[PDB]
Ligand binder design. Structure first.
Ligand SMILES: O=P(O)(O)C(O)(COc1cccc(-c2cccc(-c3ccccc3)c2)c1)P(=O)(O)O
Ligand SMILES: O=P(O)(O)C(O)(COc1cccc(-c2cccc(-c3ccccc3)c2)c1)P(=O)(O)O
Ligand SMILES: O=P(O)(O)C(O)(COc1cccc(-c2cccc(-c3ccccc3)c2)c1)P(=O)(O)O
Lengths: 218, 217
């Protein structure tokens, strides 16, 4: 398929549950179930990297804590499937507990030869670029880099997922046709694939539809 | 209410071939397709229209000629012209015609027509970064005082309404290093129609599409 890195904006969980006459909890359950199925397909299909983003003030900060807490149960199962785990996003405003709980994770799986999975939490694409810019701002304040020296190639080394294959394909489920400030810098050349299917119903045959669409769109 | 539309014009060559004609025959049709798109945007209350030609010294001269021969009309139609992109390596005459074309129509209140010229989305961001890095050297700025809004004031078209809709003709589904920072929230519309055939009807439907989706989401 000539597809190395896949990014998915997951969406439709709430909508999926409403149609079934169910409450959000039931949808998240079906969503998470869909997250496992998607990873699996990535591993079993030589995909190199898979980046996921769950699309939706105080609660938010809490919701991210439930996320880190749950992101503790599944880590073990991930190592066992030979998956390297990366967590992009603004994890700097997160307490020191969850952060170790993160590097522990990335540390542990760090050496797998399986798929590289990255999960966005408190991620922004403008912010992503910003914080890459802040790193260059520091080098300039130190006195080692001249403004006119900064080029695309340089800044690209400072944004999320620089060590990885560039994103070849972005898939958005749930019907909306917006990037909604997920990856910006990283998708300058990516194939954009939008589908009406709601996330919980997104499956292998749907992930195949997109890789075939990408492969054929060459 | 779609205020700012961005278009990636593509499929001029493919279009020619289909007629079994040469690459130049399609450029001619593309240019008519550009005029019609601009009449439409302006006749329909759009604030800004951003055009990006997609390709895969002769050119710099057709540039001067297009500007020389087409700017009086844009001005009569009250269109405000802007060229976005790196115009630094263009011979000074082109650079001077561009500056004057802009300066001529700077004050118009009609539609603002932004023409991408040797523009790249990452470049746009990088140049903004360079401006900020000068103010960090000048010691007027501290690294942790940079935020999305600050970066936002130095990316192309920061002074205009945010881009609401990006239309790409020609069938490919990529942004291809066109606007990047600017489309974090834009509607993205893909159509297989080829740029020279893309018309007032194709346009109306993209806009309608935007409306219905703006209503659903
Ligand atoms: O390759 P198989 O046929 O042995 C199998 O499909 C592999 O199952 C997995 C493959 C890839 C990833 C997982 C997995 C398990 C548990 C949690 C997660 C996980 C994925 C994404 C975010 C958090 C957690 C993934 C399981 P199985 O069902 O575990 O036997
Ligand atoms: O469409 P929404 O507003 O129901 C939502 O975007 C759905 O997004 C998800 C997609 C896939 C997986 C999840 C998810 C997995 C596991 C736990 C949770 C979760 C747990 C507790 C509270 C909120 C979310 C979410 C969420 P949200 O993040 O749950 O609000
Ligand atoms: O002949 P009509 O009825 O289509 C009409 O002239 C259209 O008016 C226009 C509005 C805005 C811009 C134009 C226009 C005219 C000629 C050239 C260009 C032009 C567009 C893009 C690049 C270079 C030139 C735009 C015309 P009018 O506004 O309805 O009088």
């Amino acid at each position: 398929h000539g597809c190395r890195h896949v990014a998915i904006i997951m969406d439709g969980n709430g909508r999926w549950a409403k149609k079934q006459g169910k409450i959000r909890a039931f949808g998240h359950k079906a969503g998470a179930k869909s997250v496992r199925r998607a990873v699996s397909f990535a591993a079993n299909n030589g995909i190199e990297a898979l980046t996921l983003y769950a699309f939706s003030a105080q609660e938010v900060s809490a919701l991210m804590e439930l996320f880190v807490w749950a992101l503790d149960s599944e880590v073990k199962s991930l190592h066992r499937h030979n998956v390297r785990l990366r967590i992009i996003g603004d994890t700097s405003r997160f307490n020191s507990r969850l952060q170790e709980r993160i590097r522990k994770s990335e540390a542990l799986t760090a050496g797998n030869t399986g798929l590289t999975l990255n999960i966005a939490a408190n991620y922004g694409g403008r912010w992503d670029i910003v914080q890459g810019v802040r790193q260059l701002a520091e080098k300039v304040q130190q006195g080692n880099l001249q403004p006119d020296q900064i080029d695309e190639e340089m800044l690209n080394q400072h944004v999320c997922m620089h060590e990885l294959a560039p994103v070849d394909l972005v898939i958005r489920t749930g019907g909306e046709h917006r990037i909604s400030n997920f990856l910006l810098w990283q998708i300058a050349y990516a194939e954009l694939y939008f589908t009406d299917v709601l996330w919980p119903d997104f499956d292998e045959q749907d992930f195949e539809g997109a890789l075939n669409a990408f492969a054929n769109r060459e």
